[PDB]
């Protein structure tokens, strides 16, 4: 899976913002993106674990 | 992860087709979606053939 960087997080959050214009057309995609954003955020703060 | 059903796969594929309307505008979304389609196809195949190694 993609390396966890803050720039990556930024890009993901930005794509999500764009998809939100068509919420019910991309409902599965939006969940996958939410999962990846969640995973990335957690990763950023657990590099020592 | 979301349960692999043929209907779910259909939904993902339909969303993938909708995304083609927006060329080069959703690169990470496209990758995540392709990854999920791949995982669901593999899961469907493995449920069909439980003894096979992928």
UniProtKB/Swiss-Prot annotation, chain B:
Expressed in proximal and distal oocytes in female worms but is eliminated from proximal oocytes following mating. Changing residue 29 to A: No effect on homodimer stability. Phosphorylated by cdk-2 which may negatively regulate its expression in distal mitotic germline cells. Undergoes proteasomal degradation in proximal oocytes following mating. Changing residue 19 to A: Moderate decrease in homodimer stability. Residues 3-54 are annotated as: Qua1 domain. Changing residue 8 to F: Moderate decrease in monomer stability. Changing residue 32 to A: Severe decrease in homodimer stability. The KH domain and the Qua2 region are involved in RNA binding. Homodimer. RNA-binding protein which recognizes the 5'-UACUCAU-3' RNA consensus sequence. Binds sequences in both the 5'coding and the 3'-UTR region of rme-2 mRNA. Binds sequences in the 3'-UTR region of cye-1 mRNA. Binds to cyb-2.1, cyb-2.2 and cyb-3 mRNA. Binds sequences in the 3'-UTR region of tra-2 mRNA. Binds to the 3' UTR of Notch receptor homolog glp-1, thereby repressing glp-1 translation in the embryo. Binding to the glp-1 3' UTR is inhibited by pos-1 binding to an overlapping binding site in the glp-1 3' UTR. Germ line-specific tumor suppressor essential for oogenesis. This is Female germline-specific tumor suppressor gld-1. It comes from Caenorhabditis elegans. The lineage of its organism: Eukaryota, Metazoa, Ecdysozoa, Nematoda, Chromadorea. The chain holds residues 144 to 195 of 463 of the full protein.
């Amino acid at each position: 899976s993609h390396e966890a960087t803050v720039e990556y997080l930024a890009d993901l959050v930005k794509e999500k913002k764009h998809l939100t214009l068509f919420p019910h057309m991309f409902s599965n995609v939006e969940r996958l993106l939410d999962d990846e954003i969640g995973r990335v955020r957690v990763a950023l703060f657990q590099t020592e674990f």
